[PDB]
């Protein structure tokens, strides 16, 4: 931990990228987190919402 | 049967042509939730309960 000042910035950037990637699994109220399936099993008028 | 003892049938391991049911005009109402009726034919489910 002598080099902790430089390790911290790498850790912070990796953590930010990890949380950004993991946010691609949320629903936010939708019926699925995958665009492909809510397009494969709904029609445009109700896939819009 | 009546709604008190509604019959359950389990459906699995075949090929289902939902198109013939959708086009069949005998049904008074044919209303699908969470899935669009015209895209049943190209989906795949694990099992169906009637």
Curated annotation (Swiss-Prot), chain A:
Segments forming a coiled coil: 7-49
Annotated phenotype, changing residue 12 to H: In strain: Omicron/BA.1, Omicron/BA.2, Omicron/BA.2.12.1, Omicron/BA.2.75, Omicron/BA.4, Omicron/BA.5, Omicron/BQ.1.1, Omicron/XBB.1.5, Omicron/EG.5.1
Function: Subunit of the fusion protein that is processed upon entry into the host cell. Mediates fusion of the virion and cellular membranes by functioning as a class I viral fusion protein. Contains a viral fusion peptide that is unmasked after S2 cleavage. This cleavage can occur at the cell membrane by host TMPRSS2 or during endocytosis by host CSTL. In either case, this triggers an extensive and irreversible conformational change that leads to fusion of the viral envelope with the cellular cytoplasmic membrane, releasing viral genomic RNA into the host cell cytoplasm.
Name this protein carries in UniProt: Spike protein S2'
Protein source organism: Severe acute respiratory syndrome coronavirus 2
Protein encoded by which gene: S
Swiss-Prot record, chain B:
Complex and partners: Binds to host ACE2. RBD also interacts with the N-linked glycan on 'Asn-90' of ACE2. Cleavage of S generates a polybasic C-terminal sequence on S1 that binds to host Neuropilin-1 (NRP1) and Neuropilin-2 (NRP2) receptors. Interacts with host integrin alpha-5/beta-1 (ITGA5:ITGB1) and with ACE2 in complex with integrin alpha-5/beta-1 (ITGA5:ITGB1). May interact via cytoplasmic c-terminus with M protein. May interact (via N-terminus) with host bilirubin and biliverdin, thereby preventing antibody binding to the SARS-CoV-2 spike NTD via an allosteric mechanism.
Domain of life of the source: Viruses
Part of the whole protein covered: 348 to 397 of 1273
Consequence of substituting residue 21 to I: In strain: Omicron/XBB.1.5, Omicron/EG.5.1
Effect of residue 24 to L: In strain: Omicron/BA.1
Official protein name in the record: Spike protein S1
Function of the molecule: Attaches the virion to the cell membrane by interacting with host receptor, initiating the infection. The major receptor is host ACE2. When S2/S2' has been cleaved, binding to the receptor triggers direct fusion at the cell membrane. When S2/S2' has not been cleaved, binding to the receptor results in internalization of the virus by endocytosis using host TFRC and GRM2 and leading to fusion of the virion membrane with the host endosomal membrane. Alternatively, may use NRP1/NRP2 and integrin as entry receptors.
